Design a binder for this molecule. Sequence first.
Ligand code: CWC
Ligand code: CWC
Ligand code: GSH
Ligand code: GSH
Ligand code: MG
Lengths: 198, 198
Amino acid sequence: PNYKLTYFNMRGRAEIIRYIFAYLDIQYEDHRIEQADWPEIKSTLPFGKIPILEVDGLTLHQSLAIARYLTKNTDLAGNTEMEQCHVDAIVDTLDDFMSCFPWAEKKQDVKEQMFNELLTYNAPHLMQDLDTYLGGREWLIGNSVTWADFYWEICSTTLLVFKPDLLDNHPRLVTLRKKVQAIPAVANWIKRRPQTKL
Amino acid sequence: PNYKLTYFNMRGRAEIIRYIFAYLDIQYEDHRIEQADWPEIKSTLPFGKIPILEVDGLTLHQSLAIARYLTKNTDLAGNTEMEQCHVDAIVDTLDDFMSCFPWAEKKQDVKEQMFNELLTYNAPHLMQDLDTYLGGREWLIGNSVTWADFYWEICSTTLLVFKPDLLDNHPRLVTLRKKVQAIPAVANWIKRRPQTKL
Ligand SMILES: CN(C)CCCC(=O)Nc1cncc(-c2cccc3[nH]ccc23)c1
Ligand SMILES: CN(C)CCCC(=O)Nc1cncc(-c2cccc3[nH]ccc23)c1
Ligand SMILES: N[C@@H](CCC(=O)N[C@@H](CS)C(=O)NCC(=O)O)C(=O)O
Ligand SMILES: N[C@@H](CCC(=O)N[C@@H](CS)C(=O)NCC(=O)O)C(=O)O
Ligand SMILES: [Mg+2]
């Protein structure tokens, strides 16, 4: 099966998919577009949003729907039906927060305001909830790595760009990040991927 | 299993779970709370949000994570892995849009203006995408009903409270609502359920 992933030249919402392809050792075309090219592609898409994944002439959309599809019947999914629910719940909780940021805001003063509010007021409480949820366990769900751990690592990486001191009082969440980053397939991708801010 | 759903006295984010329970003929306690008992329960919740589902003492959160868990290994989920991806993608698309509305805004004039803005520009754009995606086909995904159809009907029911003429130029989306509402288990629930605005 031939895979083509289309997104902007960033980690962003597409990176979870990039991690999953790397972990499962699946070859794919990593198509990165400029904003100048986007409107022409946008107009042809059913819902006009990216990332999209083309699989055998069939265009999938929604990053987490795609991530779930790719991890289905693999070791990145939950090991029980209930664990799969916990995986989906943690990912959605993270996705809910990341989606609050006005990534596409053109007015800089309004953008900086919102980022500062979310990072200063809201982010610390999410960290507290995540840290308590993890407890003293090795991974977020179950006894082995899932794509929820991937998603945590990806979200936290972007948050740390704007607020470097986010996990100062959360050593266990730092440990989880480093374990995800230590997985060979993930480590390899982290080193070779295009180095962008977001 | 012993199920207990906790949410406000409204359809809201919980209604998709209530539809699935009714369609699959699965018994559960539909616990509806007032504002008075929310702070007490909120403290016991790992992530401080509802709906939540308690399954034999084990708590679950995130409405769509719970919905997907309940539809596991049924035809409601989608027949193939690819269809299940389409189902997930449509639901997330609808959920993304419904999440844009300022449901908890206390400034009534601000709320009015933001609702009007979303219903005038964004809603019609999404409706055209949904309508063309459905085409002249019977259901949104595949040959039979999925919980994506349920979710469309639920979301559109709330949207029609604020803009009654939203689907007046989309007869195919009106037809889809009617088909879902006519499903015996859904028809029974819609008659039974408490009457609320949202
Ligand atoms: C052209 N520019 C204005 C558009 C670029 C959009 C952008 O910066 N996307 C972006 C950048 N960083 C994070 C997310 C994001 C949003 C929601 C959930 C997410 N999860 C991981 C990243 C992520 C999204
Ligand atoms: C005053 N406050 C305590 C009540 C706020 C509850 C409320 O109005 N929630 C609500 C009401 N109507 C729709 C949604 C909603 C939000 C996001 C995705 C959704 N999908 C279906 C409903 C829905 C949520
Ligand atoms: N919930 C969707 C959201 C996708 C989305 O909104 N993507 C943004 C970029 S991060 C986009 O397409 N922006 C360009 C546009 O809206 O025209 C997902 O996770 O895929
Ligand atoms: N993505 C979550 C969002 C849940 C959510 O935010 N629910 C609202 C009520 S509809 C809530 O509990 N808000 C927290 C609060 O204001 O106390 C889900 O779908 O379950
Ligand atoms: Mg979501």
